[PDB]
From a paper:
Here, we describe structure–function investigations of two bacterial enzymes: an enzyme from Thermotoga maritima previously suggested to be a galactosaminidase and another from an environmental sample (termed Env-[name] here), which has 99.2% identity to an enzyme from Myxococcus fulvus with NCBI reference WP_074950922.1. We could not detect any binding, or enzymatic cleavage of the GAG oligomers, for the T. maritima enzyme, which raises the question as to whether the T. maritima enzyme is an endo-galactosaminidase or whether GAG is not a substrate for this family. The enzyme from the environmental sample was tested with purified Pel and showed good activity towards the isolated Pel, with a preference for GalN-rich oligosaccharides, confirming that the new family [name] has members with galactosaminidase activity, with a preference for partially deacetylated stretches of Pel. While the GH135 and GH166 families are both retaining α-N-acetyl­galactos­aminidases, GH166 enzymes also have a preference for partially deacetylated stretches compared with the GH135 enzymes, which is in line with the observed specificity of Env-[name]. The two [name] enzymes overlap well on each other, with an r.m.s.d. of 1.48 Å over 252 residues, while only having a sequence identity of 28%. Whereas helices α1, α6 and α8 are absent in Ega3, both bacterial GH191s contain the α1 helix as a structural element. A comparison of the substrate-binding crevices shows that beyond subsite −3 in both bacterial structures a loop around Asp64 (TmGH191 notation), connecting β2 to α2, partially closes the crevice. To gain better insight into the substrate interactions, we docked the substrate into Env-[name] and FsGH114. In both cases up to seven subsites could be identified. Whereas the Env-[name] binding crevice seem to better fit the galactosamine oligomer, the FsGH114 crevice can accommodate either an acetylated or a non-acetylated GAG oligomer equally well. The crystal pathology of Env-[name] was dealt with using a nonconventional procedure described in Section 2.
Author numbering: 197 to 468
Write the structure that this text describes.
Amino acid sequence: QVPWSNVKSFTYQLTNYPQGKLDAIAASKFDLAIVELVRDGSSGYFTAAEISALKARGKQVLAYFEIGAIEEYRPEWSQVPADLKLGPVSGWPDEQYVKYWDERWWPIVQGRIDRALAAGFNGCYLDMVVTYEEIPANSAGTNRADLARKMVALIARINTYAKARNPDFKVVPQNSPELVDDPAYLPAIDGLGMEDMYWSDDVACDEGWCEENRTNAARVRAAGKLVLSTDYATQSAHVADAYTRSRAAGFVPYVTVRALDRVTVNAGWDPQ
């Protein structure tokens, strides 16, 4: 395997696995792959044998899963009572933000960690960290800063649990880099995934919020964590700009399509 410290490229695909298999990802030349635990968006977990097949080609493999929301099409839906739900993510009630600090949410999270370990992933790639800021500020009867501390506490809980079972198992939150301000954050993570720092569907991330994301990523990188940047662009000047600026900042870039439904290969930028 490529060591964690020498990861210099990654691909990232969450759906549309051909024939429900990882063969195209296995064949690609990236140092690291982010894939779902499941081949079907639901309960068809990839097996140790399938994950081993990627690792044998030298890749680190991270398991994407959400820690801040649940969806009706996911197997744990029926374990989530109404009291854990905080509202629709994108208007559709079949995708709900959850009370991620609640002890009743922990078995769902734990079960995903356990599945990641059972399939021999190298680590986890944690989505819906942003739940901390997307739910009402009074969701825990407190405020936004308390919700932030709760989300960092959950990431730290994940890390301690996972490392106890595999001390090599990496923890990589996606987005929400500003959580780095909490002292419990950097001791709980091994890397950070950041979307949309440079190019978002071929539109520049040129707002103040973009710059704050980049400088918070710089904070995480300064603490020796792997930063995997994903940008979304097909225009060649934009692809080049994301790769160039990401690498200049000390990050590891990938540029792909928002659907995350294929292994994009950007000739001249990605390994071939």
